[PDB]
Ligand binder design. Structure first.
Ligand SMILES: CCC(C)(C)C(=O)C(=O)N1CCC[C@H]1C(=O)OCCCc1cccnc1
Length: 107
């Protein structure tokens, strides 16, 4: 599954809905702390639409639990991420992923 652990609270009332665009900042890490990517290093938020099937399943499920303004750590099991394939060259097979995600805005 995905485990959502809060870093900073959101407004507690504006949660993303299917068809909305979530504007997030993120840093993705492996369980040992190794960063594999971060939009914070590019200083440009990442956008995805909820329910469109264009991000990994632990994101659709985890970010839907977040209210605008919230910063949380999402621990995602491999079956909710890249499974046995992994992402060629970046994520190994069977990897648990840890994302530090801040939900900035809904568009
Ligand atoms: C390593 C690939 C990259 C940079 C997009 C990433 O880190 C990533 O996946 N990321 C980084 C932010 C969002 C997340 C994502 O969109 O998951 C997509 C993976 C599922 C998928 C969909 C279509 C084709 N291949 C894979």
């Amino acid at each position: 599954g995905v485990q959502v652990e809060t870093i900073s609270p959101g407004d507690g009332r504006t949660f993303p809905k299917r068809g909305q665009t979530c504007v997030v900042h993120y840093t993705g890490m492996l369980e040992d702390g190794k960063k594999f990517d971060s939009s914070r290093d590019r200083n440009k938020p990442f956008k995805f639409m909820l329910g469109k099937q264009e991000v990994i399943r632990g994101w659709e499920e985890g970010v839907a639990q977040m209210s605008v303004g919230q910063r949380a750590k999402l621990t995602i099991s491999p079956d909710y991420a890249y499974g046995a394939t992994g992402h060629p060259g970046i994520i190994p097979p069977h990897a648990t992923l840890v994302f530090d995600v801040e939900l900035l805005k809904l568009e």
